[PDB]
Amino acid sequence: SMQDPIADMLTRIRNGQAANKAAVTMPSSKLKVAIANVLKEEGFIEDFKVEGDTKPELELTLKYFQGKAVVESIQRVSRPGLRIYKRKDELPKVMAGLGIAVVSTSKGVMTDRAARQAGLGGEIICYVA
Amino acid sequence: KIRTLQGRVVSDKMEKSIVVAIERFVKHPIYGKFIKRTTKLHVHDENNECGIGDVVEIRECRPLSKTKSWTLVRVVEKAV
């Protein structure tokens, strides 16, 4: 059902980016904040706010160029049916280093560019292309 | 320090011995899915204190019979 909420998060982002929606909302969690805050610090989105404490509701502000999709495509990589893990030297790049790959490690959620100075590996979340 | 396995007991009918099953997670060499693999070992049970389903700690010893190569340390949880 909602068994991969990160894939449910990526579904709501990709639809509203293409359908010219100004802002979207979604149910919040601890992990969804730890991904959207990275995308805010990597120029893909604008802002995120939390609403509700017994029903945590996350909001995202979209981002356009002249009405053109900033996040062109995003690809869920690991999944509950098949887990994907890499080492500190097998971290894949997205568009030969243009896009970023969201990898969650023990030092928090960061990119593969940020994992070079960290020197760790773990679970690939999504290819932010 | 020494080599030590952990698991649970699936059979205890025979005297002075129990059957302990060991589960392990294996990356598949072709697909990568983590699969539970069951390893059924025969463990020497002195005084026969282990029941069914007891999480137990076992270690390595010499072969005591045709099928046995493992012995007992202590029971982690019994008869829950």
Partner: peptide, 14 residues
Amino acid sequence: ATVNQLVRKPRARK
């Protein structure tokens, strides 16, 4: 298509 299907039986090579 599902990876979990191919755990039970792999792809049948002719």
